Amino acid sequence: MAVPPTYADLGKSARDVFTKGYGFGLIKLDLKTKSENGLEFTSSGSANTETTKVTGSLETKYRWTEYGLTFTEKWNTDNTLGTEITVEDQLARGLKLTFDSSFSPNTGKKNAKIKTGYKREHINLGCDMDFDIAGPSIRGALVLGYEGWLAGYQMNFETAKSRVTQSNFAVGYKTDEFQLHTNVNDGTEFGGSIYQKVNKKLETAVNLAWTAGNSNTRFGIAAKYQIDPDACFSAKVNNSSLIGLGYTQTLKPGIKLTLSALLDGKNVNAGGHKLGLGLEFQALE
């Protein structure tokens, strides 16, 4: 069943910053901790097999209850200072205040972005504004979720530049048989996605990318094999552009681990394949 939300899944940013490195096979570990008053602790650890460079991030969230404010601060990767504050209201709930603040002293800068979540009868409005970052930006993301129908739109307006950069549109529906997902970019970019289940404990997906400008289409096939909740196989492949496959398994006890592999043009086997491993432990005390 679709436990998580599907209306917001229709579209979302990744925030993949430009980074540089060297070496394959990357190991990652995520752990959760609790503190007095019910705090949220998140520890992330990354290490490389060949390369000799290990990093470790930490996150601390100080909260108390629903109606109130929570201060979450700590240290993020790239030697960055994390500091955000989110407060929620109980009486007549429907709005959420969130403020994300980060400061990078190591040859970096200070970034301040505020986010607000508003829930309506059947529509959600997200107000996001970037302040103190060399130009005040104001973007708004509106998402809707209906029984069988899904909608999602995101726009960004600039008060200092006075011109909307780009707008992302997403619309689709979930059927008892197949799933329809449509996504287009204001940049004349058409994107189609559909999900189809082959047989029991087996499901497939198909994706197609279209860019107004040439007769070249980017096709892609997704394979999902779920025979049990103990192990899930999820792989994604494109039109000879990129071939990736990821699978996760959980031992008898509380030991779950996810391992995947990346193959570029299915020709990296010669000596240049990529791999990603991520372990998640749960403190049961």
Binding residues for NAD(+): 242-244, 260-264
- Determine the residue type at 7: Y
- Judging by beta carbons within 10 Å of its beta carbon (0-12, 13-18, 19+), is residue 173 exposed, middle or buried? middle
Helix/strand/coil (H/E/C) assignment for every residue in the chain? CCCCCCCCCCCCCCCCCCCCCCCCCEEEEEEEECCCCCCEEEEEEEEECCCCCCEEEEEEEECCCCEEEEEEEEEECCCEEEEEEEEECCCCCCEEEEEEEEECCCCCCEEEEEEEEEECCCCEEEEEEEECCCCCEEEEEEEEEECCEEEEEEEEEECCCCCCCCEEEEEEEECCCEEEEEEEECCCEEEEEEEECCCCCCEEEEEEEEEECECCEEEEEEEEEEEECCEEEEEEEECCCCEEEEEEEECCCCCEEEEEEEECCCCHHHCCCEEEEEEEEECCC
* Beta strands 274-282; 26-33: pairing state: parallel
C-alpha to C-alpha distance for 171 and 210, rounded to whole angstroms: 16
User: Residues 32, 176: contact at Cβ < 8 Å?
Assistant: no
From the CB of residue 199, how many other CB atoms can be counted at a distance below 10 Å? Answer: 7
Q: Which domains occur in the chain, in start order?
A: 1-285 (2.40.160.10)
- Structure method: NMR
Binding residues for ATP: 12, 20
Q: What angle do CA 261, 195, 191 make, to 5 degrees?
A: 85
Enumerate long-range contacts of 119-122, CB under 8 Å, 24 or more apart. Answer: 119/93, 119/94, 119/95, 120/94, 122/146
Binding residues: 12, 20, 242-244, 260-264
Q: What angle do CA 264, 268, 270 make, to 5 degrees?
A: 170
Q: What would the two tokens of residue 92 be?
A: 């007549």
C-alpha to C-alpha distance for 31 and 12, rounded to whole angstroms: 25
